[PDB]
Design a binder for this molecule. Sequence first.
Ligand SMILES: [Zn+2]
Ligand SMILES: [Zn+2]
Length: 94
Amino acid sequence: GSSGSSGCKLCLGEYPVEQMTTIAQCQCIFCTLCLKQYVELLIKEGLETAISCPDAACPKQGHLQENEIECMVAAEIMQRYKKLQFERSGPSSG
Ligand SMILES: [Zn+2]
Ligand SMILES: [Zn+2]
């Protein structure tokens, strides 16, 4: 049977499982490249830390854990997200 390529719903491009990342939240796979630009573009902003799914048509609307991002982006970048997390912590409990 045919297998190997998982395809992408972001850049509409085909890529090997080698350069892809399967989200263990919404069984959503995407090419590192995209996922990288996605989580990055978001963090870079500095308004929201939670890295939702890069898919607008996600019935599960999963999120991207920290572990994923950590690797996805580089230390220099991660930091930006790391600080963003704290900013939004215990909005009720002090
Ligand atoms: Zn892609
Ligand atoms: Zn998803």
